[PDB]
Amino acid sequence: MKHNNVIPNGHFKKHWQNYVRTWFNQPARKTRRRAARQKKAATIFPRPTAGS
Amino acid sequence: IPTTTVQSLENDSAAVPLPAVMKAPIRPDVVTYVHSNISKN
Amino acid sequence: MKYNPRVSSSRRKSRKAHFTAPSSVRRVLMSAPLSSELRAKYNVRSMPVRKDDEVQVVRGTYKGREGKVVQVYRKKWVIHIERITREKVNGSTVNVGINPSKVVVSKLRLDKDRRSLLDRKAKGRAAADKDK
Amino acid sequence: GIDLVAGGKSKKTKRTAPKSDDVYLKLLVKLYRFLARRTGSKFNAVILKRLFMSKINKPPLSLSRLITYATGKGDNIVVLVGTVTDDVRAYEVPKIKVCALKFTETARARIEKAGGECLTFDQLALRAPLGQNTLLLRGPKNSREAVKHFGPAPGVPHSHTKPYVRAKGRKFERARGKRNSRGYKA
Amino acid sequence: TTRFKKNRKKRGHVSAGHGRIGKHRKHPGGRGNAGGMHHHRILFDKYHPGYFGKVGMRYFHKLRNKFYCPTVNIDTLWSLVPQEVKDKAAANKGTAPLIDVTQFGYFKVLGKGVLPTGQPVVVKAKLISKNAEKKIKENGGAVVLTA
Amino acid sequence: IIWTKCAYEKLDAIYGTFDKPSQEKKGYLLPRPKMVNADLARIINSDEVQS
Amino acid sequence: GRMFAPTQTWRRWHRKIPVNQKRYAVASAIAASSVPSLVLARGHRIESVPELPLVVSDSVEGIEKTSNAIKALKQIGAYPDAEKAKDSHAIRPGKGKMRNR
Amino acid sequence: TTVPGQLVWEIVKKNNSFLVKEFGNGTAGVVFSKEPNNLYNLHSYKHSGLANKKTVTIQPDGKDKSVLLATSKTKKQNKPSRLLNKSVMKKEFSRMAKAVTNQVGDNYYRPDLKKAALARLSAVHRSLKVTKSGAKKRNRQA
Amino acid sequence: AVPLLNKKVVKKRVKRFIRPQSDRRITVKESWRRPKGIDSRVRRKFKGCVLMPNIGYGSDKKTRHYLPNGFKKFVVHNASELEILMMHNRTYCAEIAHNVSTRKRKEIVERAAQLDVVITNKLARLH
RNA sequence: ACUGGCGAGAGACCGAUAGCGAACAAGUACCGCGAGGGAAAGAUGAAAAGGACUUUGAAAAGAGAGUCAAAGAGUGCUUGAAAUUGUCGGGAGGGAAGCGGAUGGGGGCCGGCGAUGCGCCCCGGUCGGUGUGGAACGGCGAGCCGGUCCGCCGAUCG
RNA sequence: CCCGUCUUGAAACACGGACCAAGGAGUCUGACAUGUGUGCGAGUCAACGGGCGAGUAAACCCGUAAGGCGUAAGGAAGCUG
RNA sequence: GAUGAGUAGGAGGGCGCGGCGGUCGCUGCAAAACCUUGGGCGCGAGCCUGGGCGGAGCGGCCGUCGGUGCAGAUCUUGGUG
RNA sequence: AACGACUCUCGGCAACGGAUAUCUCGGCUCUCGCAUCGAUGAAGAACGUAGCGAAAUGCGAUACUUGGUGUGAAUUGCAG
């Protein structure tokens, strides 16, 4: 520790590398949810897609 | 007001005013910076 | 460009599928073009080579040679043509393998299944290519 | 041998050109390189130097502060090597001729509505090649967060330097060293 | 960007810029905030006065919504009015605009700056400072309380 | 770039102008350059400068 | 053994440039496309193009066959640039060729 | 370009399809430009065929030792197919030299390029003569 | 072509700068490396030791990069690139790239004769 | 949610000391009483056309020949670096050698290693030439100011 | 005088090094800070998500009292501002 | 016009390796790699080229990126005195 | 102090060795779809099984396969 800096408080003393949550599937999740909504709309036709 | 001629194809108003976007600044530094970063996505 | 999600554009996968293809699949992969005379007759472009077909070599050092197929060696991706042979150092005669895509079928070994296959090939062309 | 320091060479560094790659800025630099050389005008020399400066050395000037400094100087043209921002705290905007590198969208609208004109430095050269009848202004250079942390350290006597802390509250650097009831006050 | 990292400029210089004498060892002064009172004492006192110790009262389960109180100053009050409404204010001096700061996400009205000259305003707010109320009144306006 | 007539006529609406904002990019205005006239020769060789 | 600093999946691959900067870059690119000197400088063959910006009749949007599409390019003078692209078809040098590129 | 030439030079001076650079960016660096309307093929704002509205092109034309003299039209900067005012010359060198001087210097089109244009015409004309007959002197004396 | 250069070329040093001890060890290549050792006698510039390259050896800027023939080299890969030297035939000489086919070298050599452009390696791979 | 299973697509990833330990009869051979430990190892040619036959030798094999575009691709065979070794040739050497600098001797290498043109005369040959007509255009901003190409006269040189 | 290295001091009777090939060491990530480039500017940020779209992991669009940081500070706090 | 030492250390301008987005090219009339008592350029990192071998790929330039540069670590594996 | 041997050195060729270059039915990483072991004897282990086979792969005394269906003329190193 040296110089004038904010006091560090990094919470990286556990096995954090085993609990990293990546988001590379974020585009895929958008696709899957859109497909689910599209499928749901046809099931409940002609009921409104907005729900109750 | 400047206008742009519309080319006609065979077997087919002939001018359109020049849109303002065509007079926008040319900033190669900005274009390169944006292009390289977004191509990573 | 391809759009079928079930079709891969991977070079690795294409090569593996080709070289591990079973014998039945290799039959289709080992197809040869019909001669201009047969094409105008049956309205068919390509046909899998058969044992008793007659073909003409149009590529390679044996270009112009004509003969009858004598063996479809699917394991080696080649066919053997009667009289298309070379001499070994000991004087023996061995047939030279030729890829079926490098020959032209001059006469077809017709049979009950072969004639039916010709009709199906011509049926699509007569409709999907002409009527459209 | 020669008894000199660094062989008599200068150890000072100043900007001889803009660090930016902005093509328009380089054209302005070329324009004012010529004006400074061929006129010897002190105004042109100052303008040329300020075009090289970094962003923090070209602080913005608020419209309200521009109005106060332009009071009683309607004829003069205001010149700013920097950006002019709009100030909601200013109500009456008189007509004024202002040249700046950049005007914010709100600042430009207010100046144009009041009958004023927003000019660039290429237009200024046509109207004031030697800087005649110009009001040269600079924005507040030291009004930014970083400067508050500069100077004597927070813990030394007679210091009002802002310390670096991740949060603000009773539990963040209020204890020993910040009051007599905990050791000392500093 | 690897090609701009200064380690590349130091290739072939042995020590990688960390010196031959001192070297670059693992943790020659302890990890993190170690020794804040012992061998990093000067650093903490010089740059982080107040770091060690306890001050004030605890507040168990403190919820920040109870303390929500956005503030707006007098000088900024006029900017909330739409431009089209500003023209109306100067077109009829008999009436005054009613500026309800709560509609713009503000609770209390503070008294920094001045109001536009010759323009009374009726300010509607939850809270207000005495200076803010005085400035509004001396300009011909009034203050209304809400909740 | 080869523009169709319909696409070319939409550029003003999509990107707006220097005076009014875009219709499809909420609150967007075209950027301004730091130099209104980039023709140095005209400025340097103008009567005002050369005097 | 194990490589130094093994590559990890949670490297920061992506970048989020502010939207306004991205819109600035697009406008500059659109403006540059109307300058014949810049278009030529980028390697495009526009020697036979009647005018820039090149605006064509909306009837081109109704073309359905590739053969008719190419005839449209010839009429407006854009075919030579299209012909340049086809004549430049080649295999990628280096390891990229076996990487499905 | 349709924009000021000075602005174009700022953009294309670093990179363009006609820029030929060899031997790196050190002392050994050599730079040339190969656009058809650059008389000396030099990468400079003076000779640039991209950053100047008024440019001179001199190159062989077809056959029969014809020399093309083309100048960019000032009002056609946005029409590439009609930007060049071509003039095919197939007369003696003296006649061609006068034509270049008339279309470059006399009309104040690009007086700063008069010397380059005449040298360009001289080089192009000499090459046409050698092509018809072939090399006969090595031009190494002096 | 008559070279335009007229000042004589003065080489401050013609010998190369060989890496120290490259003679002793096969694995130590001859390409120059600055010795960083604390005791290195080459670094400390003791007399009778290997010499280190420094800016003082810089050649005259007017005669720098000029070949003995009096021209500067420009590498050409085809006929079109050769034409770039038409107006610089008194200053720059062309050299055909090492990987150009013999068939394409004939075109370049023939074109260079018409343009009076010097070719440094015009006899390459024509036998 | 999903580093297992089954199926599928993709990549600015690795390219046989890399990438999974394992591109191959790899969790194999092998080691350990045992729990366990755990490798090395890919590429002839387009096609075996994988070298008949003669002669020497106990044999391996050599010599000649043959196949092939190529055996300077001959079954661990594409390309074939360095350490290290043999041979032929040049040279040096009184208890190291090498190295920096300066010449010399002997080698090797280099015709952009070094030119042969230019000016003025006539002999011939060849190719074009003020003033009016057309063709397609241009510079300056309606109007002035031009060149290029074709043709016709005059001029009679270049 | 033998390089590399620690050293006040190395040709050292200080240590490593028989030779060659290939492999071989300040990296990625979170937080903060100064500096610089760029955009906008009393605002700024399309970030969860939605609408879509190169038939599409990109690009494009969306902030309606959303949220972050900033726009006001002082006090342990009640509070005042 | 003046001036030139430099370990630890800092910084600038450059050289080289492999991809990616572009652009300009080369190649069975012979690419890469490798070999050479061929020649040349740069203070230098390096670069260009002759000849040979080899038999199918490769390079320049702009931008951008990285598992990007070795004489040493009783360094690793393999090979050899 | 020739010649020759020896040692060292430079070059040509030949050895030694497997670097480099170009390759790749492999690896690695991301994403997507699906939900299906077993007392009705699973996973695993052992032994056997082909005209000529040791291993790998397959199979179970019906033992590198029976049967049905599809495809429509091979399998292949040799033999038959």
Ligand SMILES: [K+]
């Ligand atoms: K995830």
Ligand SMILES: [K+]
């Ligand atoms: K350091």
Ligand SMILES: [K+]
């Ligand atoms: K292994």
Ligand SMILES: [K+]
């Ligand atoms: K070979």
Ligand SMILES: [K+]
């Ligand atoms: K030898």
Ligand SMILES: [K+]
């Ligand atoms: K040591």
Ligand SMILES: [K+]
């Ligand atoms: K010691």
Ligand SMILES: [K+]
């Ligand atoms: K030692």
Ligand SMILES: [K+]
């Ligand atoms: K700091």
Ligand SMILES: [K+]
């Ligand atoms: K906000």
Ligand SMILES: [K+]
């Ligand atoms: K929204």
Ligand SMILES: [K+]
């Ligand atoms: K208190």
Ligand SMILES: [K+]
């Ligand atoms: K390339």
Ligand SMILES: [K+]
């Ligand atoms: K060489």
Ligand SMILES: [K+]
């Ligand atoms: K690169």
Ligand SMILES: [K+]
């Ligand atoms: K010898």
